[PDB]
């Protein structure tokens, strides 16, 4: 007597009869067999289906060029609002096609967690690129998580469930592997220290001027000015008033304009929620909202320096050996002498830590003085965290997948 089949049937009958939107899900759970799997079908999703971006984008673009005869499926929250190059067909999350796609594909490629109601058969290969060298503690390494609806243990039980389905897990650096192996409950075998595919352009194209010039004129940037990128992490604290009118960025734009307006334009990469509350009138041709731009790596390439605080992008951008400033206005509130980070944040990062934005501005005045004054520290950072990206990472995965699926076209 098959007792799990019985439960899925009940559940599915309950869904059909009540007209629940998950009827499509329960049908998939009932009927999902190892035999639906067709070896030349590949699904990609990035950030839970929100973009066409990141390592899955670059993995997919590489494969479109060298292996065009496989079936490619992209998964999207809203497929109609996402443009995808090449032969790939797109599926809407939780649609019948979503589930066919995952039931059928021999390889899943993602950069974040994919849902546990999806079945990763012994027959399929789930490759997790993940999404950056960690700074804040994550997964198993966390202490508390007062996240509504779920306890710390149940949140970790679930995370561990998901990481066990990871067949391969890409890695950028020894430091990260040491961390992943613990945080994600990983077997080092499954880890591939080959760098992030999304960071291929940062090596392969860092000098292609024709290419830097399409990115710049696609953003309408001034020809005479250098580019400062500012990418603060999301903060819960600073949300108030429906989010209708925020208090001008802590970084003081009026001041930056007075200081830097002659030599610089600043790209602001905020959380989407801050992005549509920002009034940038008075700052046109100096402050450029850029939150809603598909490819952040392209933004790095055209950036002469980077301002952030507690973000993983600092490791990505470090590949370019350009200066970085850490405007950490709220560093006090963050646990004083916080080890809530895997690295020693007070000591070995590539640039100056500023708690106020006014000395930051002055420092920025002359970029080259920073570049020498921190070349010692920059190179060091490059050596720990970036000395592994080849620019061949998309290739490596792409080839692995191809190689993987030749095996399956025999026995």
Identify which of residues 14 and 365 has a Cβ nearer to a second copy in the complex: 14
321 binds Cl ion (CB under 5 A): no
Please pick, from the candidates 78, 152, 255, 372, the single residue that binds a second copy as defined by CB under 8 A.
Answer: 152
For residue 29, what are the contacts with CB-CB under 8 A and spacing of at least 6?
Answer: 8, 11, 12, 117, 119
Contact between 348 and 318 (Cβ < 8 Å): no
409 binds a second copy (CB under 8 A): no
Classified as helix, coil or strand, 81 is helix
What are the two backbone dihedrals, phi and then psi, of residue 46, each rounded to the nearest 5 degrees?
-125, 140
Identify which of residues 17 and 409 has a Cβ nearer to a second copy in the complex: 17
51 binds Cl ion (CB under 5 A): no
The alpha-carbon radius of gyration of the chain (Å, integer) is: 23
CA-CA-CA-CA torsion sign (314, 383, 184, 127): positive
Identify which of residues 161 and 369 has a Cβ nearer to a second copy in the complex: 161
30 binds a second copy (CB under 8 A): yes
122 binds a second copy (CB under 8 A): no
21 binds a second copy (CB under 8 A): no
158 binds a second copy (CB under 8 A): no
What does each C-alpha distance from 32 to 36, 104, 167, 304, 315 come to in angstroms?
7, 9, 20, 51, 40
Identify which of residues 1 and 247 has a Cβ nearer to a second copy in the complex: 1
31 binds a second copy (CB under 8 A): yes
18 binds a second copy (CB under 8 A): yes
217 binds Cl ion (CB under 5 A): no
2 binds Cl ion (CB under 5 A): yes
Please pick, from the candidates 83, 148, 209, 242, the single residue that binds a second copy as defined by CB under 8 A.
Answer: 148
5 binds a second copy (CB under 8 A): yes
144 binds a second copy (CB under 8 A): yes
Strands of the 305-308 sheet, one edge to the other: 287-289, 264-268, 226-230, 305-308, 324-327, 353-354
17 binds, among Cl ion, a second copy, none (CB under 5 to 8 A by kind): a second copy
Contact between 265 and 285 (Cβ < 8 Å): yes
- Distance CA(193)–CA(203), nearest Å, equals 17
Question: Residues 129-150, buried b or exposed e (16+ Cβ, 10 A)?
Answer: bbbbbbbeeebeeeeeeeeeee
346 binds a second copy (CB under 8 A): no
296 binds Cl ion (CB under 5 A): yes
Site for Cl ion in 73-112 (CB under 5 A): 78, 80, 83-84, 112
DSSP codes of every residue in 286-328: TEEE-TT-S-HHHHHHT-SEEEESS-THHHHHHTTT--EEEE-
Helix (H) or strand (E) holding 92: strand 89-92
1 binds a second copy (CB under 8 A): yes
50 binds, among a second copy, Cl ion, none (CB under 5 to 8 A by kind): none
- Distance CA(29)–CA(26), nearest Å, equals 5
Identify which of residues 36 and 275 has a Cβ nearer to a second copy in the complex: 36
What are the two backbone dihedrals, phi and then psi, of residue 275, each rounded to the nearest 5 degrees?
-55, -45
Cβ neighbour number for residue 64 with a 10 Å cutoff: 17
Find the residue with minimal CB distance to Cl ion: 248
158 binds Cl ion (CB under 5 A): yes
Applying CB under 8 A, the residues found at the interface with a second copy are 1-3, 5-7, 9-10, 12-14, 16-18, 27, 30-31, 33, 144, 146, 148-154
Applying CB under 5 A, the residues found at the interface with Cl ion are 2-3, 5-6, 9, 22, 25-26, 38-40, 67, 69, 78, 80, 83-84, 112-113, 120, 132, 134, 150, 155, 158, 175, 248-249, 253, 296, 312, 384
């Amino acid at each position: 007597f098959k007792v799990n089949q019985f439960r899925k049937t009940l559940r599915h009958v309950k869904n059909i009869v009540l007209r629940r939107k998950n009827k499509e899900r329960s049908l998939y759970d009932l009927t999902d067999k190892e035999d639906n799997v067709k070896p030349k079908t590949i699904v990609f999703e990035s950030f839970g289906g929100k973009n066409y971006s990141d390592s899955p984008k670059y993995i997919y673009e590489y494969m479109q060029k060298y292996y065009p005869n496989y079936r490619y499926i992209w998964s999207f929250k809203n497929p109609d609002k996402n443009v995808v190059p090449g032969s790939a067909e797109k599926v809407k999350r939780n649609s019948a096609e979503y589930y066919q796609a995952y039931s059928e594909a021999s390889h899943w490629v993602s950069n974040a967690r994919t849902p546990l109601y999806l079945n990763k058969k012994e027959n399929q290969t789930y490759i997790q690129t993940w999404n950056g060298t960690p700074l804040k503690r994550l997964a198993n390494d966390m202490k508390v998580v007062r996240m509504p609806g779920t306890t710390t243990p149940k949140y970790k039980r679930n995370f561990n469930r998901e990481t066990s389905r990871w067949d391969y897990l890409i890695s950028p650096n020894r430091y990260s592997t040491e961390i992943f192996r613990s945080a994600f409950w990983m077997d080092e075998e499954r880890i591939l220290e080959i760098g992030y595919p999304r960071n291929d352009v940062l090596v392969n194209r860092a000098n292609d001027q024709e290419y830097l010039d399409e990115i710049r004129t696609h953003l309408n940037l001034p020809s005479d000015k250098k580019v400062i990128m500012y990418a603060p992490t999301w903060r819960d604290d600073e949300f108030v008033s429906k989010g209708k009118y925020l208090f001008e960025l802590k970084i003081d734009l009026d001041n930056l304009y007075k200081e830097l307006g002659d030599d610089y334009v600043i790209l602001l990469r905020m959380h989407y929620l801050i992005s549509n509350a920002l009034d940038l009138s008075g700052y046109e041709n100096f402050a450029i909202d850029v939150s809603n731009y598909n490819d952040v790596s392209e933004l790095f390439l055209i950036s002469d320096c980077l301002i952030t605080d507690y973000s993983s992008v600092m490791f990505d951008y470090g590949i370019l050996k350009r200066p970085q400033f850490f405007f950490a206005y709220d560093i006090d509130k963050y646990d004083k002498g916080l080890r809530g980070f895997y690295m020693n944040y007070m000591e070995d990062l590539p640039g100056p830590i500023y708690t106020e934005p006014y000395g930051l501005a002055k420092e920025l005045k002359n970029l080259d003085k920073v570049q020498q004054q921190y070349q010692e520290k920059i190179d060091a950072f490059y050596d720990r965290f970036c000395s592994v990206d080849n620019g061949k990472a998309s290739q490596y995965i792409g080839d692995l997948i191809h190689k993987d699926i030749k095996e399956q076209l025999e026995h």
